Amino acid sequence: RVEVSKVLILGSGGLSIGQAGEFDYSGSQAVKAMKEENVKTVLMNPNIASVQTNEVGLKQADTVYFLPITPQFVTEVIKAEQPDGLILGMGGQTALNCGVELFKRGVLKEYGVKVLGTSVESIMATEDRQLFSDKLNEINEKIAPSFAVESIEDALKAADTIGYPVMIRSAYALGGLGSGICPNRETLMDLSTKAFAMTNQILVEKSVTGWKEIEYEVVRDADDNCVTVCNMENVDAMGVHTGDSVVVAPAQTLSNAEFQMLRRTSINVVRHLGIVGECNIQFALHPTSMEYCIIEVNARLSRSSALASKATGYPLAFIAAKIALGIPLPEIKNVVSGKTSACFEPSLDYMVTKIPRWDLDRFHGTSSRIGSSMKSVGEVMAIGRTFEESFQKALRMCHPSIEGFTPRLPMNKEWPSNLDLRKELSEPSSTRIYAIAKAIDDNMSLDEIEKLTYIDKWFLYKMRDILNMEKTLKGLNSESMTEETLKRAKEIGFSDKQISKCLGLTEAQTRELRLKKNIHPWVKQIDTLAAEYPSVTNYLYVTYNGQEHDVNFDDHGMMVLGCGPYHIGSSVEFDWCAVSSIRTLRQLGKKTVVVNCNPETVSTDFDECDKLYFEELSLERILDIYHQEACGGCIISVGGQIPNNLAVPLYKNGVKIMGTSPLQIDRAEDRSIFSAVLDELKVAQAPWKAVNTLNEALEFAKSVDYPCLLRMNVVFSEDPVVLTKFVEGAREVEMDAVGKDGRVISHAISEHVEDAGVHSGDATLMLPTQTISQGAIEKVKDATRKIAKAFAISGPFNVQFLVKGNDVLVIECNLRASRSFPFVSKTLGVDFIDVATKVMIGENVDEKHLPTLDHPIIPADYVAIKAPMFSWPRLRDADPILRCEMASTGEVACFGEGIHTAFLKAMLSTGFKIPQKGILIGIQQSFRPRFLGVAEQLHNEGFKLFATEATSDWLNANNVPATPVAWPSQEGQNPSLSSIRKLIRDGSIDLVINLPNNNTKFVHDNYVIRRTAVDSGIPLLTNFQVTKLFAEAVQKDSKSLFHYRQ
Amino acid sequence: VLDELKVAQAPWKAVNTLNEALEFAKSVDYPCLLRPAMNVVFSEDEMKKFLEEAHPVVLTKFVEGAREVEMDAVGKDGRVISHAISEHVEDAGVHSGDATLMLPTQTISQGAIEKVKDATRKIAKAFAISGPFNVQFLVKGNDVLVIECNLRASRSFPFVSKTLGVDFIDVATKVMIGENVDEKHLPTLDHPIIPADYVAIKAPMFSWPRLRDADPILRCEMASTGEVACFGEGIHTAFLKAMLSTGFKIPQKGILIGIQQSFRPRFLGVAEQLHNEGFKLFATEATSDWLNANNVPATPVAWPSQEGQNPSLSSIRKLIRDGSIDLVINLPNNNTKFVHDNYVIRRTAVDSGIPLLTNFQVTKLFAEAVQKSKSLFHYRQ
Ligand SMILES: Nc1ncnc2c1ncn2[C@@H]1O[C@H](COP(=O)(O)OP(=O)(O)O)[C@@H](O)[C@H]1O
Ligand SMILES: Nc1ncnc2c1ncn2[C@@H]1O[C@H](COP(=O)(O)OP(=O)(O)O)[C@@H](O)[C@H]1O
Ligand SMILES: Nc1ncnc2c1ncn2[C@@H]1O[C@H](COP(=O)(O)OP(=O)(O)O)[C@@H](O)[C@H]1O
Ligand SMILES: CC(=O)N[C@@H](CCC(=O)O)C(=O)O
Ligand SMILES: CC(=O)N[C@@H](CCC(=O)O)C(=O)O
Ligand SMILES: [Cl-]
Ligand SMILES: [Cl-]
Ligand SMILES: [K+]
Ligand SMILES: [K+]
Ligand SMILES: [K+]
Ligand SMILES: [K+]
Ligand SMILES: [K+]
Ligand SMILES: [K+]
Ligand SMILES: [Mg+2]
Ligand SMILES: [Mg+2]
Ligand SMILES: [Mg+2]
Ligand SMILES: [Mg+2]
């Protein structure tokens, strides 16, 4: 047993595509393990929305630093905290790369900090693709023909030796960053160039596109006991990243010989690699032989370990962390069985399906095709006891518009008239599942579909079974459908909505019809051992394929609904809110029932509540569960949009909703009612109107002046739909609050850096406010007092405001927790959700020390700043520019004595890197009056300035020196001018400032400049306010919230 | 006392030598205030030549680019039971009494207000205040520094009292003679009174025409001879009414602009704005080139010291007399090169009876406010 008294754990930082909440979940389990063994813990994670970073409970570190996960800052923390252990395996690639850099530099050795678990040597051997190859060649393991190279010239050579097509995949990365299939020389040139901006080594590898992709989660302790805890079969074949793949567990199409060969190879490889803890391993398996290739091992917790932990009920991260302290597997309890050890390989008597969630329509430049580089923003997991059951649930979980497996597209989009169905099947995309449905419907053979998609035909048989049931049901009605048929339809995952559309009924009618035949689902436990030993816990799912329930229904607990899959605009903040509520209920001795389907969340960790249903967040299924438990009530206000949109339907189906009435939530989401209420209260708002005609539109827009918002999209010229006056030059303010009986008993006001026009979630937030008049604050407060009263609010809510001097206008009101609730709560040292939860269930509340409207809590000695995270490099060709639709994928927050410090810390936490070289400046003409001073300031700080044609003339005319550069569209047409690509490549330029607006003339050229920066991996600033503040802040530490709160 | 209370203030020191002076000014950076006639200096040389004309001298770090805030308050047994915070339009450097005051504050961070308040709580207690007092603050972001404290009623007590509808002196007088006081409806530190539906602006009055040959320009020593105040739904309206109340007359014709080079980055937008409102712009040599180089049309004019030496350029006296120019904007600073010429421009406006703006912040706010009959009692309803 390793002796350690204080451990530092690293988080992932802000969430980004491929590096999501799985590490909040993992790292929380790690801290719990550490505490059980009396080990003091320090956490570094700038992701303020993470549950990890909370102060209270058995999973909370003793000390929390909201700082960049970079060697500079981790060093400062080490110095100050003098830890003797380091966990670097539970923060994705961020934490891994940071820890390897520290190691390489000898910082760990210098301060006596032991890496707990898998060594940096084992890590390097799995992250460096060449070292990996060397290791497997030592044991004559099987890999594909490949060469690890460090230049574009060497990659070309490797590809000619191997033969096209080839896959390139980066070292020291995850989620397929910089990766891609290359059918030819030119594709290889394009991609390797882009890959080298983000890594120093790529592997050029013979293609095994189409082989089956099989994963194992492997555990190995310090006694050399080594087991495979889970195995997953990817439904989409090799070539679609595991993360963007449909995946099933356990495997369905392997023989014992295949499954055991790969299992034993996993164990050998993991052993040889010196791994201690957990890891993930990937194989390519030939579809019609025993031939296989080992692709990669991830010597760290992963999105695959999170998934496996939920699928199996085996908590891999918890176990990993105990193992990192030298405790062997036989000495660690299986917490689910309560009577056995963690030395085993679970047995599942059910099948789970994970499907990804994409959000791509908003990024016009990025295709919906998927491949080796992840593009999904979330995932779901469904459990069933038939593939079909598991599979249709999982499809419904991805997005409310999806009904199951149908030949219809999501978002109610029609198929294009120029559809090439074969192309869709052969070229994976975010919508290929529905294209398969369509093809099966249109009588393409299953054999040809397997041939084009590479999806194993077995899975296709199941899909055909589903569509045959749809045909059968369509020919029936409420009188003609038998009990035998309904039962079967449910047993293969048909919802009542899907059935209703076949039968010619409403969903309610169909629910009634079903219950009238006493056809209902059954509640079953995940016990890890397929019933060999009974479960002491209640980790539950629901299935039509059983004849009994595995538990009683005597608790009558309080239901809390979770967030569903993360997607853009809906992230881990909504797991924070939900978990805060779950913990508050527990702390008050109330029985809890949780329903959520997101494998990455701490809300779907069974140790947080009395009953966890890992289930659909549908009306159908919530009703099933509520009525089966006879829950005392349901909280629908702490999991974002999904639960909130069920408020009225639930109300109407006998569900007791806690807090603010669903009647009030309806009133408030009704733009006309809401607006009329505001008029009554004398609360101002932007002029708006609903119209059906172009002439009404043009008349209204003329009557209030352009620009106008449109429902999202703004327009500035003449060259039903809701229209709203777009107010220019306006500040934006957030009010986050809790109501009790229509009174506000906690609140917090923050100011965006950016003017209205950048969406809340893409905005940078300052708390407390900075430039708002005191009279505006009074108006913001008075409008919030009246709104709370008008809608009898009892629970959390939020109101967004435009502010221009003393004009204060209401934009929107949301009668639920907003995404800024964690930021605000932690910053002010008050759990708004704890307060709100107590209001909603009638528990007492001392308002003396809360930030009521009458006695706000306003930090004096410090400020807090929240910055948005983006995933532009992974959204290939996307224009990295903020619209009225939101684009950020996560958030960070940092603290400082003042705004400049806090702002710099927040920005560094996003990956932004302070330029050491030249800055490129290109701005639309109208920004000149305000930008001149920003430019002088950058010049006076010593930055060499480059600029596009007109901007450079203008700077020089104002005695600010700038070197002009060429437009991309004009490279070669003037030999006096350097190309931007070349200046970036050479290292002359390491920050780009590009400020377009609606009157931008060179739209494409400026798009190319913006995208060049992203793809070269240098920072880009496209918002004037953010740019101003940056310039001010570089004009000139390692503290965090707890420092300032002292 | 402030150090004990942990309340910040500008570095300062009393000295009896030139070498102590220079050492200190070097140790905190120029510029520095000087009290031996208050006076600022920006260099080693500028100082030597001020002292060699004036027994110790107090030196204070002059904080540039800073907001200034007034706290007017009443204490009872060291607690604050009435208070009011106002922000100057002008940056610190223009004296309180020459400053234009906004109530409530407009551009101050909420954290700074909390600091202003906390410092006032501690000061009232440290000096066992029972009566009226005032504290002046520098504010720069969240740095809040105390300038001075006056243990008496300040000149902004009427403004503040009438604006908030509370006689601060009536309250203070009761405290001082031991009469009872209901604090429930007073603006205590814990429950301020902050106008939501209106703002108040106080503007200084000057008597430049009667001070023959006086340079009409604000120093650290004060020059105003009275005050007016007006009210509005917002700042622009209130500000225009206050300015009109001083005798300022909104230009109907051309505007003459001459500014020290360093104001250019900030002034560009002020100038574009005046141009977009339709004002014809005139300017001194360098300022006119610069405006035109930035596609803001201006007609150059001659320096007074050079009238006749270029027939392409009109004299300013003649453009004023002809009625082409009815507002002058002149913004000098320590680096102004044509000190006399710009003095003559400023004094020509005064003696022609046309309005003159010499402060950047006031000039900015003006330009914003011309972009487009009520009084306090209207708004208090
Ligand atoms: N040689 C190959 N031929 C075809 N596809 C491949 C090959 N190697 C990897 N892939 C695909 O690329 C994905 C990313 O590769 P991986 O080595 O797992 O990198 P990462 O660590 O970035 O996920 C794999 O899951 C798989 O779908
Ligand atoms: N009247 C307006 N003028 C200018 N910007 C606006 C206006 N209304 C909304 N916006 C911008 O659009 C964003 C989204 O508006 P909101 O009503 O919150 O939409 P959503 O339904 O996406 O929450 C706001 O956060 C704001 O920055
Ligand atoms: N440290 C400083 N930095 C910048 N300006 C200052 C500073 N101290 C004072 N001032 C300016 O000087 C003015 C007068 O200061 P004060 O000490 O109140 O002098 P008086 O004796 O004239 O009241 C203030 O109102 C402010 O505008
Ligand atoms: C970003 C932007 O709008 N740029 C300017 C170009 C100005 C320049 O020539 O530098 C445009 O009008 O396209
Ligand atoms: C007021 C002032 O300082 N003027 C500038 C000149 C401006 C001009 O020539 O246009 C000066 O240095 O005197
Ligand atoms: Cl929200
Ligand atoms: Cl006074
Ligand atoms: K796959
Ligand atoms: K790896
Ligand atoms: K993986
Ligand atoms: K797209
Ligand atoms: K039918
Ligand atoms: K001032
Ligand atoms: Mg990997
Ligand atoms: Mg991988
Ligand atoms: Mg919103
Ligand atoms: Mg004074």
Residue numbers in the entry:
A (entry chain A): 419 to 1129, 1139 to 1146, 1163 to 1479, 1484 to 1493
B (entry chain B): 1095 to 1130, 1138 to 1155, 1162 to 1479, 1485 to 1493
From the primary publication:
CPS1 is a complex multidomain enzyme having two separate active centers that catalyze a three-step reaction involving two highly unstable intraenzymatic intermediates and intermediate migration between both active centers. Bicarbonate is phosphorylated by one ATP molecule (ATPA) to give carboxyphosphate, which is then attacked by ammonia, yielding carbamate, which is phosphorylated by another ATP molecule (ATPB) to produce carbamoyl phosphate. The CPS1 monomer presents the previously inferred 6-globular domain architecture, with 2-domain and 4-domain respective N- and C-terminal moieties that correspond, respectively, to the small and large subunits of bacterial CPSs (these are heterodimeric, intrinsically active and NAG-independent CPSs), with an extensive interface of ~2400 Å2 between these moieties.
